[PDB]
Amino acid sequence: EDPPACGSIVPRREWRALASECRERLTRPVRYVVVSHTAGSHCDTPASCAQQAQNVQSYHVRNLGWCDVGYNFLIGEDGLVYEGRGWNIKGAHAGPTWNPISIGISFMGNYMNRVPPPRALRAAQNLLACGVALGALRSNYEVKGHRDVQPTLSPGDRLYEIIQTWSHYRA
Amino acid sequence: EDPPACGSIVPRREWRALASECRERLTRPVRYVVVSHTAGSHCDTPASCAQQAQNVQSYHVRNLGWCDVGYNFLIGEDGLVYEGRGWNIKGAHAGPTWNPISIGISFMGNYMNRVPPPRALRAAQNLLACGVALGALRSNYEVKGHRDVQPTLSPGDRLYEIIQTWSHYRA
């Protein structure tokens, strides 16, 4: 009943998310942040990106049987951040050593041969910053790429390098 | 001082704005924020809203002869914040009494019979929180409708109603 949360996150309900059934909580303050790409279709408008959020979650829940969309957060090319499992629920985006200690954020689209617009990169940053402020993320949080932790191409040839040029990024 | 990687602002260069010729500064920290609407067209995509930002700036410079777009920031229904004259330069949005001591943010569209979507409202409120964070705004800043300091419908009956329910609103 006050001013929304920092980082202009599109809340679950606004993108028509099926309710979550997850219960495992992440222990604030979280140290890690793993970045991946959905490796699916990308979107560049609020309208199209909310649908892509829905489509991604539909896959994870109806088909893979998970309690909710795997990522803690999703980033659209529309420059917005879509709320996934959020800051307090353990995700399912990086496997069994990484999920319990990090927040996973994913870029909607395949970034092997394309980069996300500056606005998406901005939305990504603004998100982590806002994580710190709340306490979800510890001030000196460390950022890994998806391949830095599992055997995968994600976050995509391009997305990867740019991330390497990020302040809080630890190889 | 204390720098925050705060908010996601579409910078001047990005929406392809003409360069500013304004040089007069505001005194940090600012105590007032005047909310207005452009009463012009609305847009719901980064692509459409960037154009729109350029149109408003275009109108204020090429037609009313001001040094740059009159607003310090503009909000899009695409849920993005657009960079105007920013936090440090005085705008022209509310007359000569109120311009030297306030930040003016304008929602792009006519909110007489429409309400801006939640994402617009969120970006505007996030924007404000960042102003505080940076020290651009007082921590006890005050939000005012355009009509509270100038006779006009701005920011539109619907939006005016919404801003009244904001935490920092004093008529």
Contact B167 A78 (CB under 8 A): no
Tokens representing B94 are 């509310």
How far away is chain B from the Cα of A97, in angstroms, using its nearest Cα?
29
By Cβ distance, the residue of B5, B123, B129 closest to A125 is B5
- Answer yes or no: are the C-beta atoms of B36 and B155 closer than 8 Å: yes
Search chain B and give the residue with CA nearest A128: B5
Burial of B143 (0-12, 13-18, 19+ CB in 10 A): buried
HEC letters along chain A? CCCCCCCCEECHHHHCCCCCCCCCECCCCEEEEEEEECCCCCCCCHHHHHHHHHHHHHHHHHHCCCCCCCCCEEECCCCCEEECCCCCECCCCCCCCCCCCEEEEEECCCCCCCCCCHHHHHHHHHHHHHHHHHCCEEEEEEEEECCCCCCCCCCCHHHHHHHHCCCCECC
Q: Say how far apart CA A115 and CA A158 lie, in whole Å.
A: 6
Contacts of B7 in chain A (CB under 8 A): 126
> What are the helix and strand counts (H, E) for chain B?
4, 6
- Answer yes or no: are the C-beta atoms of A125 and A73 closer than 8 Å: no
Q: Say how far apart CA A134 and CA A104 lie, in whole Å.
A: 17
CA atoms within 13 A on the CB side of A167: 8
Contacts of A46 in chain B (CB under 8 A): 44-45, 78-79, 117, 119
Contacts of A123 in chain B (CB under 8 A): 8
Contact B8 A129 (CB under 8 A): no
How far away is chain A from the Cα of B89, in angstroms, using its nearest Cα?
23
Q: Say how far apart CA A118 and CA B61 lie, in whole Å.
A: 27
B167 C-beta neighbours (distance < 10 Å), count: 10
- Per DSSP, B61 falls in state I
Resolution of the deposited coordinates, in angstroms?
A: 2.6
SS3 B20: coil
Architecture of domain A1-171: 3-Layer(aba) Sandwich (3.40)
A59 C-beta neighbours (distance < 10 Å), count: 15
Domains of chain A, by residue range, sit at: 1-171
* Interface mutation target, options B6, B8, B127, chain A, most CBs of A under 10 Å: B8
How far away is chain A from the Cα of B5, in angstroms, using its nearest Cα?
6
Q: Say how far apart CA B36 and CA B156 lie, in whole Å.
A: 8
List residues bridging with A143 in a β-sheet.
A33, A169
Residue whose entry in the numeric block shows the structure tokens 């709320």? A83
Q: Is A65 left (phi over 0), alpha (psi -120 to 50) or beta?
A: left
In chain B, residues 10-39 whose CB comes closer than 8 Å to chain A: 10, 14
B63 C-beta neighbours (distance < 10 Å), count: 8
Residue whose entry in the numeric block shows the structure tokens 């306490």? A135
Amino acid at A14: E
Tokens representing A31 are 């140290």
List residues bridging with A89 in a β-sheet.
A25
Contacts of B9 in chain A (CB under 8 A): 122
Contacts of A45 in chain B (CB under 8 A): 44-46, 78
Q: Say how far apart CA A156 and CA B118 lie, in whole Å.
A: 32
- H-run or E-run covering B164: helix B157-164
Residue A78 phi, psi (nearest 5) = -90, 5
Comparing CA positions, the residue from B130, B140, B167, B79 lying closest to residue A1 is B167
Q: Say how far apart CA A150 and CA A137 lie, in whole Å.
A: 22
Angle (CA) A89 A159 A129, round 5°: 45
What torsion do the CA atoms of A18, A24, A25, A30 make, to the nearest 10 degrees?
Answer: -100
- Answer yes or no: are the C-beta atoms of B14 and A118 closer than 8 Å: yes
Residues 6+ apart with CB under 8 A from A59: none
Comparing CA positions, the residue from B89, B84, B1, B88 lying closest to residue B38 is B84
List residues bridging with A33 in a β-sheet.
A103, A143
How far away is chain B from the Cα of A91, in angstroms, using its nearest Cα?
25
Tokens representing B122 are 């969120």
List residues bridging with A144 in a β-sheet.
A34
Amino acid at A77: E
How, if at all, do strands B73-75 and B102-107 pair?
parallel
